[PDB]
């Protein structure tokens, strides 16, 4: 059956076979992304790998080395015992995202407005905190908040499923 | 005899047997943690590994795949020749740490105070530099320094045995 996995572009990920345990009676495990065999492990063989991009691990997990936009999609694992029987057939959804960069915080004293902004990343949420209160969150790469007090630093955190990065600044206005 | 080894949480580590070389004259090498045999290599036999977390390498090194706060402690290696002589018995201290995150630098012009702060890490030391002079070090995740001049940018470095991460900012106060 299908679950969801999130990976970061240009990094590795390990697709692990759901609620499984490996054992000496397992003759085969094969991984197909969509309808393409990507890797196949057969107990007594050096494995079949589509390319150098994939590697089949000791316990049958698919290890993709450096994710590419062509690697996302529905993967399928089917594993067979020695008496050739299909033990399992499960499906996973690989979705890949881009990592976030460190946020920038800048401000404008006249309108008392602070802006937090980030350059890198995908499906980014930007979170603002001042001291220990969470001020605002937005799924945007740029966010502006009009302050009420300046008793504490502001913290801006940029986050997505695959990364997190934060910044702090004190609004330091001419008075 | 004994040594210390440092590993990062959620990463792998190889505990190598100091100044040893594997030859056909070695019959056995065993690795123990507390009252458990974690892994054992014995000559005409198949390896004993306590669970899937460990793997015993070709040369007898212990490979722990994904460090967990519970994996730290004294590990013992004992290796034996084919004629039953205990060739070696060495002890190693596995200390596992959390990797440092990138420091955030923010500054307050009124009291001319700069603050360097880091969110992630364990056994962290913060190191402050302005230009080429080392300003201050503190074994804390937050450090504050009141400046004298602003002719150079500040650089704050967060470091611990298993990681290091730096940042730079130019204090830019209104006149």
């Amino acid at each position: 059956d299908s679950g969801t996995v999130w990976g970061a572009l240009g990094h590795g990920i390990n697709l692990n076979i759901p609620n499984f345990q490996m054992t000496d009676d397992i003759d085969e495990v094969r991984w197909e992304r969509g309808s393409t065999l990507v890797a196949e492990f057969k107990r007594k063989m050096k494995p079949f790998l589509k390319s150098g991009a994939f590697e089949i691990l000791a316990n049958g997990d698919l290890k993709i080395k450096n994710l590419t936009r062509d690697d996302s999609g529905t993967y399928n694992v089917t594993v067979y015992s020695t008496n050739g029987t299909r033990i399992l057939n499960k499906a996973l959804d690989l979705r890949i995202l881009e990592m976030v960069s460190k946020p920038m915080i800048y401000w404008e004293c006249s309108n008392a407005t602070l802006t937090c902004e980030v350059l890198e990343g995908t499906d980014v949420e930007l979170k603002l905190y001042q001291g220990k209160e969470h001020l605002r969150s937005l799924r945007q790469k740029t966010m502006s908040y009009q302050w009420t007090n300046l008793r504490a630093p502001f913290k801006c955190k940029a986050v997505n499923r695959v990364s997190q990065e934060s910044e702090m600044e004190v609004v330091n206005c001419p008075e």
Side-chain angles (χ1 to χ4, degrees), chain A residues 159-175:
Chain A
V159 65
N160 64 13
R161 307 272 177 162
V162 88
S163 56
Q164 185 166 43
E165 221 68 63
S166 316
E167 174 59 333
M168 288 187 85
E169 223 85 277
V170 299
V171 161
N172 192 102
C173 287
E175 249 305 323

Side-chain angles (χ1 to χ4, degrees), chain A residues 111-130:
Chain A
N111 44 355
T113 311
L114 173 138
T115 302
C116 178
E117 196 181 325
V118 67
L119 261 50
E120 240 84 273
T122 264
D123 184 57
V124 178
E125 187 183 26
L126 225 47
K127 300 259 199 60
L128 238 202
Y129 310 90
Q130 177 174 20

Side-chain angles (χ1 to χ4, degrees), chain A residues 45 65 83 97 106-107 111 172 174:
Chain A
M45 192 195 58
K65 289 183 181 176
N83 49 314
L97 295 173
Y106 50 85
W107 29 278
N111 44 355
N172 192 102

Side-chain angles (χ1 to χ4, degrees), chain A residues 77-106:
Chain A
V77 228
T78 31
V79 58
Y80 304 85
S81 38
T82 22
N83 49 314
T85 330
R86 190 203 317 296
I87 314 310
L88 162 167
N89 177 187
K90 301 286 183 54
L92 297 165
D93 240 302
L94 222 196
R95 316 188 89 97
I96 90 94
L97 295 173
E98 287 179 32
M99 307 199 91
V100 130
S101 59
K102 188 180 184 75
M104 278 142 38
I105 296 175
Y106 50 85

Side-chain angles (χ1 to χ4, degrees), chain A residues 5 7-8 10-17 29-33 38-41 47-68 71 75-77 92 94:
Chain A
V5 175
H11 292 54
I13 186 70
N14 265 45
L15 296 179
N16 58 270
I17 313 181
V29 37
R30 33 174 56 224
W31 291 94
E32 300 176 297
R33 173 218 308 114
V38 150
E40 179 187 17
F41 175 64
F48 167 73
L49 286 321
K50 192 64 219 67
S51 73
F54 313 101
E55 199 192 290
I56 228 301
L57 262 29
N59 65 332
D61 294 350
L62 218 212
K63 180 251 186 51
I64 301 176
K65 289 183 181 176
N66 167 113
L67 286 167
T68 295
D71 291 316
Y75 280 76
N76 255 268
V77 228
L92 297 165
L94 222 196

